[PDB]
DNA sequence: TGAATTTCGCGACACAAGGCCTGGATGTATATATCTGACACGTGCCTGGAGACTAGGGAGTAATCCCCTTGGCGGTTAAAACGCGGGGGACAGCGCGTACGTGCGTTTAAGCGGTGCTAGAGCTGTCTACGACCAATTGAGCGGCCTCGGCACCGGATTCTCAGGCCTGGCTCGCGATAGGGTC
DNA sequence: GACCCTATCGCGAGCCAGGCCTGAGAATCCGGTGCCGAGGCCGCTCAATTGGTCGTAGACAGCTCTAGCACCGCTTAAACGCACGTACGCGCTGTCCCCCGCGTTTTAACCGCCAAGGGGATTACTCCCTAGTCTCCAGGCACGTGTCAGATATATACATCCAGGCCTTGTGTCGCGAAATTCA
């Protein structure tokens, strides 16, 4: 009786929604905590300006989002749906930065 | 006050939403941390050339052309922030 | 046809077609279940001929409705399961006056059998 | 003391061809630039420029907008053999994807 | 040659036929079968059985059970005879 | 205080000539700077190497030419060999 | 519950098995239902048909015929009936 | 007669080649087909056997790389025979 | 003259890079790939050498070729 | 009276500085950029050559050949982050053959 | 018509007294300088470019190396060149 | 020989079961009000672009030499091409249980608002060490010759490696007997 | 307590796995033979060196002012945790077909030689294109201001699923025609 889909279909709709979408996908305060954190560990008492923050998060979502189409290809060379670890490893292996 | 263990702040939703854009349809659970990790190392490669032009001109604060020259260095040009 | 035809059945799966000249045997899921023949045998035997038998595999099923059609290996079939057997081990299914096809689950009970006798 | 005319106006250009020079030479490529150059290399920039913006103003007008924004510029150069070729390493910011589902996804 | 009857009582078992759905079992001669007792094909296939296959005796008894004739008589024995052959 | 030089108006005047009734953002407008300034980079990098290796140090039209002809792909090769000939042409004809 | 000499009689059709084949049915009771006229697995099938498969009435006179017990009285009987529902 | 099972032959190869630093492509055909890509885009071009040499080297290594991702695509789809589909993937991969 | 490079070649080029076993597609999209990897670089050898105005094809030239594709090669300068 | 001499190299800073200078790389030079740089290449070609020899003696050769080139480059971690891309004429490959294409 | 080769056989000797170098490996060799240096130079331009300065110092050389050499090769190449042009301030 | 009996087969009557026509609940694409802050337009200015004319070195053009590229012939094989036997490796189908998608209540911390301040980016002024430029030097480094030994190559042992036949054993299939259950 | 009927164990016979031993082929180690290229030597020359001058690039001092950082509070979007259903990857198996190893015939690659000339490298002469400088001027940048494109949200028309109601089709039946057989 409960209206339910079939596992997939929301995914679907995400995909539709996120693809036709622009925004960002990380929330900014923890991204600039954690840019902070790795920045400090080279130089201590470093200042950031907004616009290079957002610039990082810009430059790191469009690598992820690359990477993951790469890992989607290579987990759909293994007749699979399911993305797995081992698929991002080749796929950073093949690219080379690994 | 001191920064320590911000790499959880990458939330589980938001992997999943950044996969869900790329075309990923269904994700494992030991995806999360590989993600950390490499997204970890990639800041790493990138904040160590930013932090290094910054050094090079005698500042305390990472312009956004640091960073743009830093990705421009590693083959990932960046259009929008050149000014 | 000049041969008569004469059925028995007492499990979900009757012997539906016999070629008369041993190129295949028919059989049908004559139910609304889904059959499962792991295992099961099917003997042969073609008057004074002595006897020959057909292994399944050890997990088979035939769902409700479907048809699996055991190919003699000089018909020149081509497999495709579940629908489509082709016994390579055997050229022929036999011919003669008298052919009975019976078929004999995983105990070794005989639930099918269909007999082709010519006057 | 005759009237002055832009080289752009010689040439019939929208681009500038003597900021284009200066940058030459400013730019520490060369010890000479030749005169020609800059107005082959402002030729060069109009006709790429004009390139992409027809396709971002094509794309604009398929999805009923009447003003370009960098999805429309992210779609259009993707959208396009040449553009995408010679754009290959760039990311474009707030550009999102190329909405596209692998066949083998799609319910059989 | 076969009657189209004794054709679909051999093509299958008996199971619970009726008596009247044996080859030149009839109406009559079932409701009579029926009367003294046979009241199912395969009654009267216990009564042939225990008469060994018999042609002559089955028949006789057929006649003296029911009034059947030479002809009824044969049909009823090819059929119990093919049943027999095809599936006992 | 300091003038800071931009491709604003030129990508403006371009995109009125190709579409009179269309307008574009201002981060569009950043896009296509930054992009203009790259490709810019990309040819005179080309052609300075160019002509450093036939120990030239003269950048001439020839060089932009053949610089046009490597980094352009395909169809975007010709039409550029095209219109800068065409423009220089003009250029020296007047 | 049932016999391995049960089991075998009731997987395949009984053909032309003697009667000592039925499950409870020993040497000495095979002899005598063969001297009696009851001569082979059909034929105890075919009286066991007549009686319109009574259990009462099989049992006894299968006591009354071969001296059987209650235990092989009821394995016959178990056994033909089996037969019966699986085959007829 | 002695024989070798499927495999070994294939190992001895591997382990002999990858010992070896001697170009596996005869010289004649790849200068015959240089000559014959050049042709298409000028007549009368003429070519010093150092360049010939230098594109040869270069195809063979390009082909060498190439082939290892085309082996760990198939490695990794539980495969040890590799498919078009593998070299199809790694140069998509790859950027190509 | 595609075909010039034989079978056995791309065997062995494919031994040495640790294939095991080979299919038999693989042969022609091989020579495929390496005619499109051909094409991209002399078409770049042919416009260095058009541009110094020289009939011969140089070392050098295919050397800035490759360099220009992102594939340095050593040994050959120069 | 050789500036390589004065600080202590082996590669000629007078070489590495009219490089510079006729590159046009900047329209003008430091003077201790030469020295830095050819102390830099200095460093690194000795790098390469002791991996190389290292290499050499464990196949009894004693010449160096692109073959001990190419296995000392591609055997260190940092040497072949740096040269990743590089092609070298006659070097061969490392011997690397998978886990799962070894029998058993 | 200019090249290496003394310099690497004089470093190669320093390094390995007894191993000789074969001319392949030489030509090798300088084609490796070659592309080092071109590689350095460039950053270093760029480096000086981008804080609108018009003279290449130790310090862009020092920023380049660091920028292109990974991890220890860097510290190493940044230790020696200091000692470099320490000794050759010194004297 | 005719009448009675019986069986097989045919055509109208009644039936259930299936397929086609139509309307409501349902979510999805479609048209309109509003407002707002960003985009488009209009104007002062001042520095970068333009116009003229000169010197001087970079490059085009003509001539020459030799070199190395192309073209071609004769043989010797090493490599290539084709056919055959096969057994290994790809592929499809079928459980299966385990790990992930989906949904709902919980919380917690992100996002937005508003504020201060001061560290530091940015801009301006002084001048001083530092590097470009040019004449003379001369010796460090490049071009040509020789030579001899490290290495290529060939031949012969030495140990290793891969592969298969024969022997020993275990595991399974099937007939007869001693004991168990029931009857008397 | 004796007698009839049935049931699990003992042992003969056959098929499958693994270990011992030997042989073919190869990789390897060791020594002899020759060769041509790497290392050393000598002649030569032009680019690094030295000294000095001069114009300036940036380094220091100082000031302004701005935005990054730090803080707080409210709101609620989203992260979080739990349970449950199911679908999805992994393992296993059987089928087949197809490259691999091997052998035989084929062919053209390669080496060595010869022969010419296209053009690449070089040198010399001229000239004209452009860096440089001064002088002039207007094009685009900084600033302000208005208004409408699109985000936001609500109300409405249209496609889709599913059920109720009406029409068409296949089927079973029972009285009777057609034909054969036995007894009055």
């Not at chain 2, 904040?47 to 960073?67: C, G, L, Q, S």
């Not at chain 3, 046809?1 to 059945?9: D, G, K, N, P």
């Not at chain 5, 059929?79 to 006992?88: G, S, T």
């Amino acid at each position: 009786k409960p209206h339910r889909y079939r596992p997939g279909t929301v995914a679907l709709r995400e995909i539709r929604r996120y693809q036709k979408s622009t925004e960002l996908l990380i929330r900014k305060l923890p991204f600039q905590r954690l840019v902070r954190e790795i920045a400090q560990d080279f130089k201590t008492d470093l200042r950031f300006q907004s616009s290079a923050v957002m610039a990082l998060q810009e430059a790191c979502e469009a690598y992820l989002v690359g990477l993951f189409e790469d890992t989607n290809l290579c987990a759909i060379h293994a007749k699979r749906v399911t993305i797995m670890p081992k698929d991002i490893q080749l796929a950073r292996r093949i690219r080379g930065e690994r | 006050k001191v920064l320590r263990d911000n790499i959880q702040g990458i939330t589980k939703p938001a992997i999943r939403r950044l996969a869900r854009r790329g075309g990923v349809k269904r994700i494992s659970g030991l995806i999360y941390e590989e993600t950390r990790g490499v997204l970890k190392v990639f800041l790493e490669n990138v904040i160590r050339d930013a932090v290094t032009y910054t050094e090079h001109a005698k500042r305390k604060t990472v312009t956004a052309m640091d960073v743009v020259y830093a990705l421009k260095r590693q083959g990932r040009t960046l259009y929008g922030f050149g000014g | 046809s000049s041969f008569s035809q004469h059925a028995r059945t007492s499990g979900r799966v009757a012997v539906e077609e016999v070629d008369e000249e041993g190129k295949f045997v028919r059989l049908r899921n004559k139910s609304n279940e889904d059959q499962s023949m792991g295992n099961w045998q099917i003997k042969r035997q073609n008057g004074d001929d002595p006897l020959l038998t057909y292994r399944f595999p050890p997990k088979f099923t035939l769902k409700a409705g479907q048809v699996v059609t055991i190919w003699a290996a000089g018909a020149g079939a081509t497999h495709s399961p579940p629908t489509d057997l082709v016994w390579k081990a055997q050229n022929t299914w036999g011919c003669g006056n008298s052919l009975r096809t019976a078929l004999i689950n995983s105990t070794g009970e005989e639930v099918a059998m269909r007999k082709l006798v010519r006057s | 003391r005759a009237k002055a005319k832009t080289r752009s106006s010689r040439a019939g250009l929208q681009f500038p061809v003597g900021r284009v020079h200066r940058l030459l030479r400013k730019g520490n490529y060369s010890e000479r630039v030749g005169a020609g150059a800059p107005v082959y290399l402002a030729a060069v920039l109009e006709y790429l420029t004009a390139e992409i913006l027809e396709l971002a103003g094509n794309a604009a007008r398929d999805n009923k907008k009447t003003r370009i924004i960098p999805r429309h510029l992210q779609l259009a150069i993707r959208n396009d053999e040449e553009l995408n070729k010679l754009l290959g390493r760039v990311t474009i910011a707030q550009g999102g994807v190329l909405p596209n589902i692998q066949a083998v996804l799609l319910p059989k | 040659t076969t009657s189209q009857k004794h054709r679909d009582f051999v093509a299958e078992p008996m199971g619970e036929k009726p008596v009247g759905s044996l080859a030149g079992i009839g109406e009559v001669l079932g409701k009579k079968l029926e009367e003294r007792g046979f009241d199912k094909a395969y009654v009267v296939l216990g009564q042939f059985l225990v008469l060994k296959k018999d042609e002559d005796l089955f028949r006789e008894w057929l006649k003296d059970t029911c009034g059947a004739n030479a002809k009824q008589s044969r049909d009823c024995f090819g059929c119990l005879r093919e049943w027999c052959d095809a599936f006992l | 205080r300091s003038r800071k030089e931009s491709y604003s108006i030129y990508v403006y005047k371009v995109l009125k000539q190709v579409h009179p009734d269309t307008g574009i953002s201002s981060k569009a407008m950043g896009i296509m700077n930054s992009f203009v300034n790259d490709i810019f980079e990309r040819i005179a990098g080309e052609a300075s190497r160019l002509a450093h290796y036939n120990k030239r140090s003269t950048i001439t039209s020839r060089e932009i030419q053949t610089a046009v002809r490597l980094l352009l792909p395909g169809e975007l090769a010709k039409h550029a060999v095209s219109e800068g000939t065409k423009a220089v042409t003009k250029y020296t004809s007047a």
